[PDB]
mmCIF file of C-alpha atoms in Angstrom:
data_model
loop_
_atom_site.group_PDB
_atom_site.id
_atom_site.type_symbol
_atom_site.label_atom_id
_atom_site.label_comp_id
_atom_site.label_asym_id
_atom_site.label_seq_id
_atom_site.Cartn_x
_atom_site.Cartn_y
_atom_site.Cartn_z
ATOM 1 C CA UNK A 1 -3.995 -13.735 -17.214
ATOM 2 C CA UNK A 2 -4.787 -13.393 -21.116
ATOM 3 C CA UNK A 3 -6.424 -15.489 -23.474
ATOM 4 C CA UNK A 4 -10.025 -15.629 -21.886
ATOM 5 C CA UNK A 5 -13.129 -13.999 -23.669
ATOM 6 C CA UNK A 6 -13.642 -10.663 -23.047
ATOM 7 C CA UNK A 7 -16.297 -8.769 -21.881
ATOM 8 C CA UNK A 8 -18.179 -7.451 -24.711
ATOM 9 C CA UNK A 9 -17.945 -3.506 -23.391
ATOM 10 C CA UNK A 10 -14.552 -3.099 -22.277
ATOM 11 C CA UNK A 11 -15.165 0.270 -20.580
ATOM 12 C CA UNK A 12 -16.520 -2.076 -18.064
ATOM 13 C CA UNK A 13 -13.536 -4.158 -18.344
ATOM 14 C CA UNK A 14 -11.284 -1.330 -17.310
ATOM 15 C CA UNK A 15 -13.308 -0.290 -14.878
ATOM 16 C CA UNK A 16 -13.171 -3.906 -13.067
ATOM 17 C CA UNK A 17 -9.636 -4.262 -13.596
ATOM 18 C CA UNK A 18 -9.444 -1.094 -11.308
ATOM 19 C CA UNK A 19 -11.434 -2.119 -8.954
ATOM 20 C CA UNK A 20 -9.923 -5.405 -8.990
ATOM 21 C CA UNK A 21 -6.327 -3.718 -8.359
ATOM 22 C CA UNK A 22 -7.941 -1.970 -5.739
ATOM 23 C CA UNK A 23 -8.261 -3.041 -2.738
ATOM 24 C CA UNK A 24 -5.002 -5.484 -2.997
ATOM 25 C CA UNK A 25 -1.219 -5.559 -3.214
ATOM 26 C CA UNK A 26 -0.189 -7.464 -6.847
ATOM 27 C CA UNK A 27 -1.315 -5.766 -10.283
ATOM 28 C CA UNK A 28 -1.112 -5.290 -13.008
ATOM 29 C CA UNK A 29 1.008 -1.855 -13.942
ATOM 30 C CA UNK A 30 -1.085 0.923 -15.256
ATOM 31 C CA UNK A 31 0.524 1.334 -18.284
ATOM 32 C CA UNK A 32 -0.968 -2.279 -19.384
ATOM 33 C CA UNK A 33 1.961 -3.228 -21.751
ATOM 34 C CA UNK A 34 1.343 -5.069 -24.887
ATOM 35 C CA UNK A 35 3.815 -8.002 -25.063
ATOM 36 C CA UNK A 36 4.747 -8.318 -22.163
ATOM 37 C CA UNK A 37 4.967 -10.380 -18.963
ATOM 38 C CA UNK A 38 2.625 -8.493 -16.851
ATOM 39 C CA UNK A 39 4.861 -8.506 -14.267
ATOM 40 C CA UNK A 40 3.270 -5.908 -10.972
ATOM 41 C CA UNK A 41 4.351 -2.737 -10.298
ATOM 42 C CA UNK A 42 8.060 -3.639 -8.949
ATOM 43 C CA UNK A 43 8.715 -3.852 -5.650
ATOM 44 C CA UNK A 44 11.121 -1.137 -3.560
ATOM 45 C CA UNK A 45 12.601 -2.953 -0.352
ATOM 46 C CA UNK A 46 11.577 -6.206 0.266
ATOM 47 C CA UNK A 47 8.844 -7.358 2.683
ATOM 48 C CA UNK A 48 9.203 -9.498 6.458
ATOM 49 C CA UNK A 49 9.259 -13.178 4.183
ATOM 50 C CA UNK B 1 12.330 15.584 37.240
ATOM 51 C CA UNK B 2 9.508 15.888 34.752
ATOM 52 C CA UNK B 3 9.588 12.479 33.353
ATOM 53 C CA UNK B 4 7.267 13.349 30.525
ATOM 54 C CA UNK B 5 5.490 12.882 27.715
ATOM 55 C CA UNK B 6 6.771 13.612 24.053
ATOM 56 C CA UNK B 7 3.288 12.888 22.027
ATOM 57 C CA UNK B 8 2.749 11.004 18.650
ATOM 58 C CA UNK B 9 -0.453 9.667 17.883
ATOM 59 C CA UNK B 10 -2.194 6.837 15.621
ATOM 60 C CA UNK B 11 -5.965 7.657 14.128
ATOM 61 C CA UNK B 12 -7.625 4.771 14.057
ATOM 62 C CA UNK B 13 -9.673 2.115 13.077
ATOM 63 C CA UNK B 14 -9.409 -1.942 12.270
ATOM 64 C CA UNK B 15 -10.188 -5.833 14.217
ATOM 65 C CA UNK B 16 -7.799 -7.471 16.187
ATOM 66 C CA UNK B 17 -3.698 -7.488 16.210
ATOM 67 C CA UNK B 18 -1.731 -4.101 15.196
ATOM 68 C CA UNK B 19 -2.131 -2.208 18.818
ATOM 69 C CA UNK B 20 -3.372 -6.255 19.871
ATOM 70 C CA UNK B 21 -0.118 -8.041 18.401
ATOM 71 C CA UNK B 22 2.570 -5.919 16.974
ATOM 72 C CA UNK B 23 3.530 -2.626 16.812
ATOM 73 C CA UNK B 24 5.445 1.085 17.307
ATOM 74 C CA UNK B 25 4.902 5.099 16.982
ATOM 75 C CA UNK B 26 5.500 6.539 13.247
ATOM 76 C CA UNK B 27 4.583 3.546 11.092
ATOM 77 C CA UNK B 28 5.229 0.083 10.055
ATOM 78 C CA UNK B 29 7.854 -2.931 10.697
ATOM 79 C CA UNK B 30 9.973 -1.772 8.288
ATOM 80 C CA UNK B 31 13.219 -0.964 6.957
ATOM 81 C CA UNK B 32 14.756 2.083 4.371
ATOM 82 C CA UNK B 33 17.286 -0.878 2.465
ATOM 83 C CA UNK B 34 20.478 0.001 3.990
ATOM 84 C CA UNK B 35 22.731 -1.799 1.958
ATOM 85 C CA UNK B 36 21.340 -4.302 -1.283
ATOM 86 C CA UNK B 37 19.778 -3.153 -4.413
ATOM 87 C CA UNK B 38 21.306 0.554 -4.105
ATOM 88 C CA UNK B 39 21.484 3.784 -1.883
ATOM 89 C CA UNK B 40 19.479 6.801 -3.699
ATOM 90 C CA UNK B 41 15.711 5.465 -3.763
ATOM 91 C CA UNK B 42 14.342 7.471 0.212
ATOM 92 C CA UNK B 43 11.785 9.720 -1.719
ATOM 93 C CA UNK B 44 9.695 5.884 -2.717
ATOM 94 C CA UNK B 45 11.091 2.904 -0.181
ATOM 95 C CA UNK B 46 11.636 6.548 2.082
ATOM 96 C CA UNK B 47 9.156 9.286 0.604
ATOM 97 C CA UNK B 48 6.718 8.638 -3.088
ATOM 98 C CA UNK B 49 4.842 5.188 -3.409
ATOM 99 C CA UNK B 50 5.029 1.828 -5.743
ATOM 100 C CA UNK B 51 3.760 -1.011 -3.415
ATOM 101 C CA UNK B 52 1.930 -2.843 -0.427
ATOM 102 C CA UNK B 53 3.195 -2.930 3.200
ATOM 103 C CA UNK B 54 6.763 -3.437 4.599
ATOM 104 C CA UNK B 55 5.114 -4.568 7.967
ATOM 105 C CA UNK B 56 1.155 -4.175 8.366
ATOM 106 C CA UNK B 57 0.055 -4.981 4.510
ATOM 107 C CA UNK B 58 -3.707 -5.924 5.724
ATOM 108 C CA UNK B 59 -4.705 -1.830 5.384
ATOM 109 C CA UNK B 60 -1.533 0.965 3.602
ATOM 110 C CA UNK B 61 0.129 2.889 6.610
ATOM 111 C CA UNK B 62 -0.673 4.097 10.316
ATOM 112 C CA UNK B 63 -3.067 6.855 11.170
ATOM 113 C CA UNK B 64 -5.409 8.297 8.245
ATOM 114 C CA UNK B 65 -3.194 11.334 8.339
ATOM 115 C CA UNK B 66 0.750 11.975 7.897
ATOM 116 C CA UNK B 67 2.565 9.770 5.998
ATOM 117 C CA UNK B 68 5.354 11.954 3.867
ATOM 118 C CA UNK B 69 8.021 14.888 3.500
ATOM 119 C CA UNK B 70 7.341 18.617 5.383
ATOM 120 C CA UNK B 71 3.801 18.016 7.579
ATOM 121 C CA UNK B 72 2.475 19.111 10.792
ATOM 122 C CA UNK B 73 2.420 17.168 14.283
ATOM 123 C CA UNK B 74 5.500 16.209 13.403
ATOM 124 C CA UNK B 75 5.747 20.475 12.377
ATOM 125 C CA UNK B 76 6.639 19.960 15.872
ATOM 126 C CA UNK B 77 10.102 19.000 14.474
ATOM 127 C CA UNK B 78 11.952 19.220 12.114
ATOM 128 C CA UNK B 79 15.152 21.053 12.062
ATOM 129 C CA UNK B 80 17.248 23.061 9.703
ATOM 130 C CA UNK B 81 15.846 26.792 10.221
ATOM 131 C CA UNK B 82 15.733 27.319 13.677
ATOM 132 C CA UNK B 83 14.704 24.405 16.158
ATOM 133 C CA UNK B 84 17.600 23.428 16.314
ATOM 134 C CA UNK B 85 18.654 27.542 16.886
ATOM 135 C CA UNK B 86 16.275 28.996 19.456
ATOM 136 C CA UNK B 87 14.923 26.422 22.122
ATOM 137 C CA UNK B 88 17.351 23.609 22.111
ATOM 138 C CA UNK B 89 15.487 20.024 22.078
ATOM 139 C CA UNK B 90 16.135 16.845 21.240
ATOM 140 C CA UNK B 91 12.665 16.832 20.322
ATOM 141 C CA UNK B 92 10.513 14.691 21.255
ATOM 142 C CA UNK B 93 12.821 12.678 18.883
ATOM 143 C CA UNK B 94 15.768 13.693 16.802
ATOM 144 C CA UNK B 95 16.178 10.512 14.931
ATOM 145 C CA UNK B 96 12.601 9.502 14.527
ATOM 146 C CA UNK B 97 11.847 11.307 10.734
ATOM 147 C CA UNK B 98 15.870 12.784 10.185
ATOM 148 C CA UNK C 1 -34.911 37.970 -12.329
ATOM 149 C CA UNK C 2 -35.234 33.501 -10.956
ATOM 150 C CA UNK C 3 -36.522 31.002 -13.633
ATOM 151 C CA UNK C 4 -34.665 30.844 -17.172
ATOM 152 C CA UNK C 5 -32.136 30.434 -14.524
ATOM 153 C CA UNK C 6 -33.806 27.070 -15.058
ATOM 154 C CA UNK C 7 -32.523 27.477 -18.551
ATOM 155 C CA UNK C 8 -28.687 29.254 -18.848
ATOM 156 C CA UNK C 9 -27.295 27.422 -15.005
ATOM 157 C CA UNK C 10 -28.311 23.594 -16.268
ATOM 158 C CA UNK C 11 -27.837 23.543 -20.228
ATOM 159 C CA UNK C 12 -23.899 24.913 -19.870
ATOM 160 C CA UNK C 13 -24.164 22.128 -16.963
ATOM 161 C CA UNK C 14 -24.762 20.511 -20.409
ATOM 162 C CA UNK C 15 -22.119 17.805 -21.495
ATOM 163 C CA UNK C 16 -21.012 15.356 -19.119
ATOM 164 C CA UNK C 17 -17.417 14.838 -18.478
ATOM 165 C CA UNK C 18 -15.742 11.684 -18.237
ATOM 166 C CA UNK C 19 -14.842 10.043 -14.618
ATOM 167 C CA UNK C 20 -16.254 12.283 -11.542
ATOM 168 C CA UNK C 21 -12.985 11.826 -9.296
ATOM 169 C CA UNK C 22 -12.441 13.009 -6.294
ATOM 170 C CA UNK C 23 -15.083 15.022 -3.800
ATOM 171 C CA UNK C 24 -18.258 13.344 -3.464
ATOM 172 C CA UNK C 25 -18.115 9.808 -2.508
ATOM 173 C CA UNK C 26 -20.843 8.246 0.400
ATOM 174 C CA UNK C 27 -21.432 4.788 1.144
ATOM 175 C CA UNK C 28 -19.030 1.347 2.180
ATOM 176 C CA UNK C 29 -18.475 0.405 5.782
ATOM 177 C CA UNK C 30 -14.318 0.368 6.868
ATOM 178 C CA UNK C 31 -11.136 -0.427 6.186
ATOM 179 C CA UNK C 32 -12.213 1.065 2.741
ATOM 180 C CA UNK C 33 -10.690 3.492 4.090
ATOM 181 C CA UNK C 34 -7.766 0.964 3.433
ATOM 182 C CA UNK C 35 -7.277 0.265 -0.214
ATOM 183 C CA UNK C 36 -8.233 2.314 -2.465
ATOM 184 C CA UNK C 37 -10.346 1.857 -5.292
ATOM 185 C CA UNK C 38 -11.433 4.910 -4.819
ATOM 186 C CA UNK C 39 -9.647 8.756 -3.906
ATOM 187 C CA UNK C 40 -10.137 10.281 -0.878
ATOM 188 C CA UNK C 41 -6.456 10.626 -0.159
ATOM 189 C CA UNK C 42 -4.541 13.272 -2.494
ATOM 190 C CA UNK C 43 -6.941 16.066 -1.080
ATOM 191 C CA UNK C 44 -7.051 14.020 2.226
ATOM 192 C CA UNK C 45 -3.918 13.604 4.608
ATOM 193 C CA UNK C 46 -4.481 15.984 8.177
ATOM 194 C CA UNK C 47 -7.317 18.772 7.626
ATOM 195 C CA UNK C 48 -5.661 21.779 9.114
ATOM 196 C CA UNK C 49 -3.505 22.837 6.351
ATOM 197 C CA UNK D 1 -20.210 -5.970 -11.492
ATOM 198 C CA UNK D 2 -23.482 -6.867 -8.719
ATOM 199 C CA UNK D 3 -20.031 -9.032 -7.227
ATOM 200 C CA UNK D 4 -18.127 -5.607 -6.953
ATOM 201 C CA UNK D 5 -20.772 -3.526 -5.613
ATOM 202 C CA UNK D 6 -21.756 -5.951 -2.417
ATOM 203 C CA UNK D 7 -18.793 -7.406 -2.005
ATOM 204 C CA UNK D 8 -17.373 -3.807 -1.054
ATOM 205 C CA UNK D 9 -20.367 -2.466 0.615
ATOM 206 C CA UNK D 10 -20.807 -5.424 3.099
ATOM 207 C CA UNK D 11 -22.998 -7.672 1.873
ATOM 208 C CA UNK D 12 -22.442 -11.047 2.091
ATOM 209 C CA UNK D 13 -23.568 -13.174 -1.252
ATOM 210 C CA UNK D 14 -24.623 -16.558 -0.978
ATOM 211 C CA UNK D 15 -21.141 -18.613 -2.101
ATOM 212 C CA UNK D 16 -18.674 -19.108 0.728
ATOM 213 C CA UNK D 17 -14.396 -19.262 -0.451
ATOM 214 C CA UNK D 18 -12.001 -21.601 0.991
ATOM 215 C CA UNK D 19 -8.707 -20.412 1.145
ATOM 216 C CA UNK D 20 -5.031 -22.257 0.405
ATOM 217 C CA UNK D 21 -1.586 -20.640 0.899
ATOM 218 C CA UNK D 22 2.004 -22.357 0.640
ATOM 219 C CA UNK D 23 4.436 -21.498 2.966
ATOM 220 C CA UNK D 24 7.888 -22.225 3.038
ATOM 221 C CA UNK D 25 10.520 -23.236 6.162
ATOM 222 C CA UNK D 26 14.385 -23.649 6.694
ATOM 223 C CA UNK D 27 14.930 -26.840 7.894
ATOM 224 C CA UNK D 28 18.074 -28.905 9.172
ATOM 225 C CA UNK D 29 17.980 -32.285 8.018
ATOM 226 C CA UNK D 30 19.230 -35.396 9.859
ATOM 227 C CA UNK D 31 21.434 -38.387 7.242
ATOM 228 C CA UNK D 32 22.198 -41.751 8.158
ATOM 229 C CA UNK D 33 24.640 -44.180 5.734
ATOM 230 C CA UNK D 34 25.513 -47.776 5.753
ATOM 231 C CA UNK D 35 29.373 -48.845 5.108
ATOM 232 C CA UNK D 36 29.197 -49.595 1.451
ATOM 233 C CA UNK D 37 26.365 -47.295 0.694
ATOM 234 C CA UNK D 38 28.273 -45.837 -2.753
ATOM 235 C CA UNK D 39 30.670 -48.049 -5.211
ATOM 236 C CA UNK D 40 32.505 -45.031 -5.941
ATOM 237 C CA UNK D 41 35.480 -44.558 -8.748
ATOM 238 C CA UNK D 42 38.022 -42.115 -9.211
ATOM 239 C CA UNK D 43 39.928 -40.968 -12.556
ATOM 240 C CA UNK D 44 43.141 -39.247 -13.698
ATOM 241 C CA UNK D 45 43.246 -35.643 -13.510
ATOM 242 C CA UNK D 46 44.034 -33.511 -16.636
ATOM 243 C CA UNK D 47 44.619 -30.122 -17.349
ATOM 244 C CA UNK D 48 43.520 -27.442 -19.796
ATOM 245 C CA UNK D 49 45.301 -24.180 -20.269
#
């Protein structure tokens, strides 16, 4: 999600968005594209459901 | 008539339902994608990375150490030079990794 | 001859560089080895080779 | 960031979650109909080449 305010530094806001795509399946794709949907890094062969 | 072994093996560690629910010897419920979205991607859905788990995602893949293309206790295997040339085996397996 | 080795082996240990990646992490409890923020993998897969 | 650093290393802040998931299932249904349940009307075909 965009539109929130930022943190003021945004070293640390990197930073948390790394750790914050660690430790978990769905995120955001490194690349963090500009205009765009956001959509996570797209799935190869699909998953039990 | 020596009814034995053929070892794999699956370092270690979580709680309670993989080897307590679940589960096999060289790692995950799974599936390559036969036939669907298309046939050359086996190097990541069968050897890079993109994703989470195609059974187990709770933790990424079996044991903390052999998960891709030319490694070792499987270097018990594979089979183009000469293991399949100078003692013959189906070995331990022979479609497990081929 | 041992102590301006103080001063020539620190000061060109003298600018920092910018993320410290990959050998010498310590201190988290489990299945940390199981998502990774954090490296340990790509030089980490089955010692002996 | 205090959030990142106990969160993985074990600790257990004082706040609690409650999770929700939505799950989906395949069903077979079961229909029952009166006699005159639909007033239904029919037209004249006609045909575009």
């Amino acid at each position: 999600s965009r539109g929130g305010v930022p943190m003021l530094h945004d070293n640390v806001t990197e930073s948390l968005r790394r750790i914050t795509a660690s430790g978990g399946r769905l995120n955001p794709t490194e690349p963090l594209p500009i205009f765009g949907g956001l959509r996570p890094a797209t799935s190869a062969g699909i998953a039990r459901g | 008539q020596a009814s034995v072994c053929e070892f794999v093996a699956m370092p270690v560690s979580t709680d309670l339902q993989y080897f307590r629910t679940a589960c096999n010897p060289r790692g995950r419920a799974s599936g390559m994608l036969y036939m669907g979205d298309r046939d050359a991607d086996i190097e990541a859905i069968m050897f890079d990375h993109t994703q989470s788990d195609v059974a187990y995602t709770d933790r990424a893949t079996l044991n903390p150490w052999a998960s891709q293309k030319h490694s070792y206790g499987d270097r018990l295997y594979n089979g183009t030079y000469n293991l399949t040339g100078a003692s013959p085996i189906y070995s331990p397996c022979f479609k497990f990794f081929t | 001859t041992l102590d301006v080795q103080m001063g020539r082996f620190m000061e060109t240990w003298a600018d920092m560089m910018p993320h410290h990646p990959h050998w010498v992490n310590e201190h988290l409890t489990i299945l940390q080895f199981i998502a990774p923020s954090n490296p340990r993998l790509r030089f980490e897969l089955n010692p002996a080779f | 960031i205090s959030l990142t650093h106990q969160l993985r290393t074990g600790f257990h802040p004082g706040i609690a979650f409650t999770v929700v998931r939505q799950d989906r299932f395949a069903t077979e249904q079961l229909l029952y109909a009166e006699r005159a349940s639909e007033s239904y009307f029919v037209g004249q075909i006609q045909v575009h080449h």
